From a paper:
[name], a member of [name] transporter superfamily that locates in the inner membrane of mitochondria, plays crucial roles in hemoglobin synthesis, antioxidative stress and stabilization of the iron transporter mitoferrin-1. Recently, it was found that [name] is a [name] biliverdin exporter. Each monomer contains two parts, the transmembrane domains (TMDs) and the nucleotide binding domains (NBDs). Here we report the cryo-EM structures of [name] in apo ([name]-apo) and biliverdin-bound form ([name]-BV) at 3.67 Å and 2.85 Å resolution, respectively.
Author numbering: 156 to 205, 207 to 528, 532 to 724
The structure:
């Protein structure tokens, strides 16, 4: 905890030291200002002598001290703010890397709102409570120490009087401040309860009107708001008492401090300037107390934010993200098998997902699953989740030992409703390739021509640089699926995993989709998951899944003449 907070400021060792030096300089040459003002006043009022040549020099000299204080304050502010920024940036980048490196299963139990809030709000608190708050704390502490210590040096007898009435009175103020707060909380609770009755009923005007009971709601609300009104009166009385007592006490305390200082004769006589210095120091101490209180509150909030931020950066990923082996050397075309895998979602272990599999995929096949949960094979083949009780083999060797990046690069998937990123079409297509920057302009046009997407990609109102997304230029479903079809062609997937929408679409544009969605059967091992009979009659195997198991694993001819039907 506290040991790790020192680590954050370790990159900034030289910047922060200068800030503390300039802070202490400013405090020193700012708490010796009341002392000189007393001398200046005594030059002209306690005994005027015969005060025009011994006054210009003093003011002219003190102006220089004021200038130095201003410069020191400026430099301190600049250094502290820059250090805060340069710590917050590092925290933000490291937190984003740690979050993005984690496994998929973590995002199921954690909402995006919490992660975004940690990414923006809490980092500001953790970067401000280690540099831009300790300066204020140190300044407040120095102010209080120098103020109280030097207040005894001017008049000890009057300093023991100001520490016998101010302390006990301020104790009552803290006690009296909680009564008003609890009364206000009570009134606010009653108002919230009354409002919760007026939001439900407006939400159900249809049912409150069928029976004809509408006025009765008006009297119920009237009674509730009257009850809220009566409790609010008891708050006003206490507030009036507080205001009167606080004004009277302050005025009488100042008058009593002033009055006593004129009756001290002989032993400790107070010239005009010394009284002014005394009063200034009292004010300074009064400010410093509130400074300390604010510092403590801010420090506690900062520790609260740090408690949550100090966790994601130190969490081990559940499954390996790198450090694998790539066999390559060709001799690999979609030859994968299953060994009766059993697993449910890690998010929900209640209902089973896959209880049995005996499915095999050969080279140059258009094998097609069918049934009624069958879409989760997509998740398994790309190594996002992990089998619980089973084994997936790819050309003898299993997919566990392989490096996930190369495996996910070779396997390419196409769906019906694809997520579209907020960028130009000239980039989204390049997103498939290994290097999105190293793409020629004509390659995008050629790929659009292959997928027949030039009808809209070239002819935008903003051209190729159109921002595509849910906002602004809304692309149609057919076009936004044709762009996805064109996306995967650049990475040359040896295994293609299509998908079928249950809801039908317009047949006017169906020719282009039928020329890209299932016309990509260019010798690639394809596991089409569809329901149309055309794919069933235009493929090798039509294996059927039902009740979490594989029943039929024959070609189309064998399954064509079912024993029952």
């Amino acid at each position: 905890e506290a040991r790790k907070l020192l680590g954050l400021a370790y990159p900034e060792r030289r910047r922060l030291a200068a800030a503390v030096g300039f802070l202490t300089m400013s405090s020193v040459i700012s708490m010796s200002a009341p002392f000189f003002l007393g001398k200046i006043i005594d030059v002209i009022y306690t005994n005027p002598t015969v005060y025009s040549d011994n006054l210009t020099r003093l003011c002219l000299g003190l102006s220089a001290v004021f200038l130095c204080g201003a410069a020191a304050n400026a430099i301190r502010v600049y250094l502290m703010q820059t250090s805060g920024q340069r710590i917050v940036n590092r925290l933000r980048t490291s937190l984003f890397s740690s979050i993005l490196r984690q496994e998929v299963a973590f995002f199921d139990k954690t909402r995006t709102g919490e992660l975004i809030n940690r990414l923006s709000s809490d980092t500001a608190l953790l970067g401000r409570s280690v540099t831009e708050n300790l300066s204020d704390g140190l300044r407040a502490g120095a102010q209080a120490s120098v103020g109280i210590s030097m207040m005894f040096f001017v008049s000890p007898n009057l300093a023991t009087f100001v520490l016998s009435v101010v302390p006990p009175v301020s104790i009552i103020a803290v006690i009296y401040g909680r009564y008003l707060r609890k009364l206000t909380k009570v009134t606010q609770d009653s108002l919230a309860q009354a409002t919760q009755l007026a939001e439900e009923r407006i939400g159900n005007v249809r049912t409150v009107r069928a029976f004809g009971k509408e006025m009765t709601e008006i009297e119920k609300y009237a009674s509730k708001v009257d009850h809220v009104m009566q409790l609010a009166r008891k708050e006003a009385f206490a507030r009036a008492g507080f205001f009167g007592a606080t004004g009277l006490s302050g005025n009488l305390i100042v008058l009593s401090v002033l009055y006593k200082g004129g009756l001290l004769m002989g032993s400790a006589h107070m010239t005009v300037g010394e009284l002014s210095s005394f009063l200034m120091y009292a004010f300074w101490v009064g400010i410093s107390i509130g400074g300390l209180s604010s510092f403590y509150s801010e420090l506690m909030k900062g520790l609260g934010a740090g408690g949550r931020l100090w966790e994601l950066l130190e969490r081990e990923p559940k499954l390996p993200f790198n450090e694998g082996v790539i066999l390559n050397e060709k001799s690999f075309q979609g030859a994968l098998e299953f060994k009766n895998v059993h697993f449910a979602y890690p998010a929900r272990p209640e209902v089973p997902i896959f209880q049995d599999f005996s499915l095999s995929i050969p080279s140059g096949s258009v094998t097609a699953l069918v049934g009624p949960g069958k879409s989760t094979v997509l998740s398994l083949l790309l190594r996002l989740y992990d089998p619980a009780s089973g084994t997936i083999s790819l050309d003898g060797h299993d997919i566990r030992q392989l490096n996930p990046v190369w495996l996910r690069s070779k396997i390419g998937t196409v769906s019906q409703e694809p997520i579209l990123f907020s960028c130009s079409i000239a980039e989204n297509i390049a997103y498939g390739a290994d290097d999105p920057s190293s793409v020629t302009a004509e390659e995008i046009q050629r790929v659009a021509e292959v997928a027949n997407a030039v009808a809209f990609i070239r002819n935008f109102p903003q051209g190729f640089n159109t921002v595509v997304g849910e906002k602004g230029v809304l692309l149609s479903g057919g076009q936004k699926q044709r762009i996805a079809i064109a996306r995967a062609l650049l990475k040359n997937p040896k295994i293609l995993l299509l998908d079928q929408a249950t809801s039908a679409l317009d047949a006017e544009n169906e020719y282009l989709v039928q020329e890209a969605l299932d016309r990509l059967m260019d010798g690639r091992t394809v596991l089409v998951i569809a329901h149309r009979l055309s794919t069933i009659k235009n493929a090798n195997m039509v294996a059927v899944l039902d009740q979490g198991k594989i029943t039929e694993y024959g070609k189309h001819e064998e399954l064509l003449s079912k024993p029952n039907g």
